[PDB]
Design a protein around this motif. Structure first.
Motif, PDB file in Angstrom:
ATOM      1  N   UNK A 134       0.820  -1.215   0.000  1.00 17.92           N
ATOM      2  CA  UNK A 134       0.000   0.000   0.000  1.00 17.92           C
ATOM      3  C   UNK A 134       0.853   1.265   0.000  1.00 17.92           C
ATOM      4  N   UNK A 135       2.099   1.190   0.478  1.00 19.79           N
ATOM      5  CA  UNK A 135       2.956   2.377   0.467  1.00 19.79           C
ATOM      6  C   UNK A 135       3.389   2.719  -0.956  1.00 19.79           C
ATOM      7  N   UNK A 136       3.898   1.726  -1.679  1.00 18.42           N
ATOM      8  CA  UNK A 136       4.367   1.958  -3.030  1.00 18.42           C
ATOM      9  C   UNK A 136       3.209   2.175  -3.995  1.00 18.42           C
ATOM     10  N   UNK A 137       2.124   1.427  -3.839  1.00 18.58           N
ATOM     11  CA  UNK A 137       1.108   1.408  -4.881  1.00 18.58           C
ATOM     12  C   UNK A 137      -0.158   2.168  -4.522  1.00 18.58           C
ATOM     13  N   UNK A 138      -0.220   2.786  -3.342  1.00 17.57           N
ATOM     14  CA  UNK A 138      -1.339   3.682  -3.048  1.00 17.57           C
ATOM     15  C   UNK A 138      -0.825   5.027  -2.558  1.00 17.57           C
ATOM     16  N   UNK A 139      -0.025   5.015  -1.491  1.00 19.89           N
ATOM     17  CA  UNK A 139       0.346   6.278  -0.848  1.00 19.89           C
ATOM     18  C   UNK A 139       1.239   7.117  -1.762  1.00 19.89           C
ATOM     19  N   UNK A 140       2.272   6.514  -2.347  1.00 17.70           N
ATOM     20  CA  UNK A 140       3.198   7.318  -3.146  1.00 17.70           C
ATOM     21  C   UNK A 140       2.525   7.947  -4.361  1.00 17.70           C
ATOM     22  N   UNK A 141       1.728   7.232  -5.162  1.00 16.39           N
ATOM     23  CA  UNK A 141       1.041   7.915  -6.272  1.00 16.39           C
ATOM     24  C   UNK A 141       0.045   8.958  -5.805  1.00 16.39           C
ATOM     25  N   UNK A 142      -0.690   8.684  -4.719  1.00 17.57           N
ATOM     26  CA  UNK A 142      -1.647   9.671  -4.233  1.00 17.57           C
ATOM     27  C   UNK A 142      -0.928  10.903  -3.693  1.00 17.57           C
ATOM     28  N   UNK A 143       0.157  10.717  -2.922  1.00 16.31           N
ATOM     29  CA  UNK A 143       0.866  11.886  -2.407  1.00 16.31           C
ATOM     30  C   UNK A 143       1.578  12.643  -3.523  1.00 16.31           C
ATOM     31  N   UNK A 144       2.121  11.931  -4.515  1.00 11.06           N
ATOM     32  CA  UNK A 144       2.750  12.604  -5.646  1.00 11.06           C
ATOM     33  C   UNK A 144       1.740  13.452  -6.410  1.00 11.06           C
ATOM     34  N   UNK A 145       0.537  12.913  -6.634  1.00  8.67           N
ATOM     35  CA  UNK A 145      -0.480  13.673  -7.353  1.00  8.67           C
ATOM     36  C   UNK A 145      -0.909  14.901  -6.564  1.00  8.67           C
ATOM     37  N   UNK A 146      -1.073  14.759  -5.246  1.00  5.56           N
ATOM     38  CA  UNK A 146      -1.368  15.925  -4.409  1.00  5.56           C
ATOM     39  C   UNK A 146      -0.324  17.016  -4.582  1.00  5.56           C
ATOM     40  N   UNK A 147       0.957  16.657  -4.457  1.00  7.87           N
ATOM     41  CA  UNK A 147       2.006  17.671  -4.527  1.00  7.87           C
ATOM     42  C   UNK A 147       2.058  18.321  -5.916  1.00  7.87           C
ATOM     43  N   UNK A 148       1.970  17.518  -6.978  1.00  9.44           N
ATOM     44  CA  UNK A 148       2.036  18.083  -8.325  1.00  9.44           C
ATOM     45  C   UNK A 148       0.812  18.945  -8.614  1.00  9.44           C
ATOM     46  N   UNK A 149      -0.380  18.388  -8.408  1.00 10.41           N
ATOM     47  CA  UNK A 149      -1.595  19.037  -8.882  1.00 10.41           C
ATOM     48  C   UNK A 149      -2.030  20.208  -8.001  1.00 10.41           C
ATOM     49  N   UNK A 150      -1.727  20.196  -6.695  1.00  7.80           N
ATOM     50  CA  UNK A 150      -2.129  21.327  -5.858  1.00  7.80           C
ATOM     51  C   UNK A 150      -0.990  22.262  -5.490  1.00  7.80           C
ATOM     52  N   UNK A 151       0.268  21.824  -5.566  1.00  6.20           N
ATOM     53  CA  UNK A 151       1.372  22.618  -5.027  1.00  6.20           C
ATOM     54  C   UNK A 151       2.346  23.108  -6.091  1.00  6.20           C
ATOM     55  N   UNK A 152       2.966  22.201  -6.847  1.00  3.77           N
ATOM     56  CA  UNK A 152       4.128  22.541  -7.666  1.00  3.77           C
ATOM     57  C   UNK A 152       3.834  22.662  -9.153  1.00  3.77           C
ATOM     58  N   UNK A 153       2.867  21.936  -9.681  1.00  2.00           N
ATOM     59  CA  UNK A 153       2.683  21.891 -11.117  1.00  2.00           C
ATOM     60  C   UNK A 153       3.032  20.524 -11.675  1.00  2.00           C
ATOM     61  N   UNK A 154       2.923  20.430 -12.990  1.00  2.57           N
ATOM     62  CA  UNK A 154       3.143  19.161 -13.658  1.00  2.57           C
ATOM     63  C   UNK A 154       4.587  18.742 -13.443  1.00  2.57           C
ATOM     64  N   UNK A 155       4.805  17.637 -12.738  1.00  2.31           N
ATOM     65  CA  UNK A 155       6.141  17.100 -12.533  1.00  2.31           C
ATOM     66  C   UNK A 155       6.322  15.840 -13.355  1.00  2.31           C
TER      67      UNK A 155
END
Ligand code: HEM
Ligand code: RQB
Ligand code: RQB
Ligand code: ZN
Length: 403
Positions: A134-155
């Motif tokens: 669940x860390x690799x296949x749920x948390x990391x993609x969900x947290x990456x999408x949060x950071x890109x889409x709400x904070x930094x932009x398209x990474x």
């Protein structure tokens, strides 16, 4: 006899030191940084934490400044830089941009895809026979999408990897050398010096875009100022979100009765989100403030220039505030937890954090057949991180009931 800090409690089992300090009479107790040897004050009681974090005589900016007494082994900055994104935005007159880009309007704009993505990631795992992470296949993609889409932009994937690596390498008490730890911050800074303006221009309504486009004094906000914002957003949003969502999944999966209750009562999910924020221990260090003048709290004289730490985990597990503090009790009505801190510097991302946490809780509550694949003591932890995170969360399906 003097106690060194931190307490090396890298897993979710909290150090017995907090209870020892909470039992002391004083609202703050002296400790010494294991890295720098600086002498620090440490509060562990909820009552003391409320008074300390509501006091205007304790400054966050001053404790962040280079040269302050500190708990961490190296300065958390590219050398020679201010590295205080909050002070930056205040100076630039941009506090409202942050509030607006993280406020309930921003949450309303993002909660749809956040919930869809949580559901996409979890339903994708329904096909796994045997054990999945669940860390690799749920948390990391969900947290990456949060950071890109709400904070930094398209990474790009490589840019995401770099930023995640810098956060994990820089935000540590131990486990890397001092030069490697400095290099985490200089690599992140150099990255944003080059790319922050480009990221700010990518499509979407991410916060970096709002910052870069906001009018300020004397021309556009400089590349250096945007870079300072970038590093702030990485350390504030990336390892916190991934560490917390990992720890919250472990808490849920260790309490299958709680999961089953939320499955039958989705209206109870917001209360469970708040209890997850109290119960799940995120940080291995403490929030900190510098006294900008002498002050006295419940008998203890704190002198100007001294640094006061508050362990939010200790506070959230204080039995004087929370009956049965080490029990996960989702219907707990109060009191208010310290998972987002307290006062002036209460987490400005709290609404977006709660949004992602709630999406995660609901993805689990819809599938009470989700189970941990090993015993909790069989989970391994990254040692030395400021923000605790397990190496993996092996999980499995007992059944596929969902609604
Ligand atoms: C998109 C996600 C997030 C963003 C953008 C964000 C942003 C920030 C920022 C900018 C600060 C510094 C505020 C200041 O010093 O004035 C902060 C502080 C804080 N954040 Fe968040 N955060 C996020 C997620 C989280 C999560 C998931 C947690 C806990 C589960 C959390 C807990 C805290 C706490 C406790 C502080 C207070 C630190 C202190 O008092 O010095 N944050 N956050
Ligand atoms: C959200 N958040 C803010 C700070 C203070 C300071 N502020 C910055 O902008 C820079 C960026 C790189 C490091 N920084 C800092 O440590 C901080 C420390 C540890 C964990 C999270 C932190
Ligand atoms: C639970 N929680 C505690 C903090 C304070 C932060 N915690 C640390 O361990 C590092 C060590 C050096 C300085 N630090 C801090 O100031 C924090 C920040 C963002 C999100 C959650 C947070
Ligand atoms: Zn059912």
């Amino acid at each position: 006899a003097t106690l060194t800090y931190p307490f090396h409690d890298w897993s979710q089992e909290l150090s017995p030191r907090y209870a020892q300090l909470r039992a002391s009479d004083a609202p703050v107790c002296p400790v010494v940084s294991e890295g720098t040897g600086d002498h620090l004050w440490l509060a562990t009681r909820y009552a003391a934490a409320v008074e300390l974090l509501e006091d205007p005589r304790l400054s966050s900016e001053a404790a962040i400044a280079s040269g302050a007494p500190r708990q961490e082994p190296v300065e958390l900055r590219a050398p020679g830089t201010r590295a205080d994104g909050v002070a930056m935005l205040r100076e630039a007159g941009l506090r409202s941009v942050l509030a607006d880009g993280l406020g309930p309007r921003a949450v309303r704009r993002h909660q749809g895809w956040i919930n869809d993505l949580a559901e996409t990631l979890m339903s994708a795992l329904a096909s796994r026979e045997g054990t999945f992470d669940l860390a690799a296949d749920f948390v990391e993609p969900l947290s990456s999408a949060l950071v890109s889409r709400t904070l930094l932009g398209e990474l790009s994937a490589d840019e995401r990897d770099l930023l995640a690596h810098c956060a994990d390498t820089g935000l540590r008490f131990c486990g890397v050398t001092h030069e490697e730890q400095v290099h985490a911050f200089t690599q992140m800074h150099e990255f944003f010096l080059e790319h922050a303006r480009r990221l700010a221009g990518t499509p979407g309504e991410h916060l970096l875009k709002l910052i870069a486009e906001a009018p300020v004094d004397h021309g556009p906000l400089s590349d250096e100022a945007l870079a300072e914002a970038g590093s702030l957003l990485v350390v504030a949003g990336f390892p916190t979100s991934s560490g917390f969502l990992c720890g919250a999944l472990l808490t849920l999966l260790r309490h299958p009765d709680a999961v089953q209750e939320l499955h039958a009562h989705p209206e109870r999910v917001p209360s469970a989100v708040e209890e997850l924020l109290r119960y799940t221990p995120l940080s291995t260090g403490s929030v900190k403030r510098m006294a900008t003048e002498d002050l006295e709290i419940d008998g203890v004289r704190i002198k100007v220039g001294e640094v006061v730490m508050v362990s939010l985990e200790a506070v959230n597990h204080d039995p004087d505030a929370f009956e049965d503090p080490d029990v996960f009790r989702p219907g707990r009505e109060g009191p208010m937890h310290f998972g987002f801190g307290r006062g002036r510097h209460f987490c400005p991302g709290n609404r977006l954090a709660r949004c992602v946490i709630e999406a995660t809780v609901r993805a689990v509550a819809r599938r009470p057949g989700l189970r941990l694949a090993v015993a909790p003591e069989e989970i391994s932890w990254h040692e030395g991180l400021f923000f605790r995170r397990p190496r993996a969360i092996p999980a499995t399906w007992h059944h596929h009931h969902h609604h």
